[PDB]
Structures are given as C-alpha cells and as structure tokens.
Amino acid sequence: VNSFSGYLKLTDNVYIKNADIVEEAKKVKPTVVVNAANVYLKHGGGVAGALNKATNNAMQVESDDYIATNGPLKVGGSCVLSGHNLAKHCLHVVGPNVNKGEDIQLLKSAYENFNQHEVLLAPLLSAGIFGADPIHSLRVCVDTVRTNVYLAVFDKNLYDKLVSSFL
C-alpha cells in the first residue's frame, strides 16, 4: 500500500492521473520524482522548469555542480540527485527532444532508467516541449517500465485522450 491517490490503473504496474507533478510531489513526498531533464540539466521550462522553480532554484544549483564534475548526461540516460522539498530523490531522465532531431528510439532507453526504482512519480518522457507524441510515450512506458509508476499528466484534455485511446 502506498499514498498515491486518485489514479486510474492502466496495467499491473502503471497508473495515471490528471495532476500537476509539482503539487503531487509536494503532497505525496514520494521516494522518487522523475524530472524531464536535458543533458545539461538546464531546468528552464516544461516539467523541469516547474520542478526547479518549486525548489527555489536549489535543483539548478545542485545540477550545475553535478555537470561541472561529471559533464553532460547521455540522451536516454539519467542521474539521481536530491529531491529537495519535493521528494527524497529526483531521477533526472533525458528523453529524446524531437525539436532537436533526436532519435525517438532512445525513448525506450530513457524509460529503462525507471526500472532501477521500485516506485516513481513521473511525467510522460519526451512529451510537452520535448515534442514527442504523448500517446506513443505512454505506450513505450507501459511496454518498458516494470516497476510501479504513477504518471502525472498536467493537461486535462491530454489525459482524457490518453485514457480513452489506451489499448
């Protein structure tokens, strides 16, 4: 039993809700919140900008030190950093950005990072300003993640479409 509330169950291990991931993170305090990161951990907009703003820029400060030490992530890769006031940990995952021409096949590799964590609160990778089709992202999620994932979808219209079109 966990504290996630109001989710629709899609499969054995995938759940979905219309929610603001920032507000869901602050209420749940999950062990892991997933950020929709880029390779530079520059949290300027989309989910990343919202999560970083909610940490009063502490996420960005920590991320800049991470990059100065380790260099950029790989597209499809991830790193674990602090969850600050939102979660125990933040798993920064880099899905391909279609608006940069990155290979959509890397979306599966991106979701594989979720399997290293038993339970996660996450957005749909490569959705929003990353330019992928969220229906495809949901399909890859369901077909790749085996651990328990709670997907927060900000846009109510999109959510209804994701639920209604799910196979």
Ligand X SMILES: CN(Cc1ccccn1)c1ncnc2[nH]c3cc(F)ccc3c12
Structure-token match 């995952």, residue found: 93
Q: How far is the CB of 152 from ligand X (least distance, A)?
A: 5
From candidates 155, 156, 160, 165, binder to ligand X by CB under 6 A: 155
Residue nearest to ligand X (CB): 128
The CA–CA distances, whole Å, from 166 to 4, 8, 79, 124, 131 equal: 21, 12, 30, 14, 20
Cα 151 to chain centroid distance, Å, stands at: 8
d(CA 8, CA 112): 22
From candidates 93, 127, 140, 141, binder to ligand X by CB under 6 A: 127
Chain breaks in the chain (C to N over 2.5 A) after: none
- Give burial (CB, 10 Å; 0-12/13-18/19+) of 56: exposed
Does residue 112 belong to the site contacting ligand X (CB under 6 A)? no
Which residues within the stretch 5-44 sit at the binding site for ligand X (CB under 6 A)?
20-22
Residues that contact ligand X, how many (by CB under 6 A): 15
Stretch that binds ligand X, among 2-10, 87-95, 105-113, 123-131 (CB under 6 A): 123-131
Does residue 46 belong to the site contacting ligand X (CB under 6 A)? yes
Which residues within the stretch 47-76 sit at the binding site for ligand X (CB under 6 A)?
47, 50
Does residue 163 belong to the site contacting ligand X (CB under 6 A)? no
Stretch that binds ligand X, among 60-68, 72-80, 86-94, 147-155 (CB under 6 A): 147-155
Query: Which residue(s) pair with 14 in the sheet?
Result: 149
CA angle in degrees (0–180, nearest 5) for 9-14-5: 55
Q: Under the rule (CB under 6 A), what is the footprint of ligand X?
A: 20-22, 46-47, 50, 123-124, 127-128, 152-155, 158
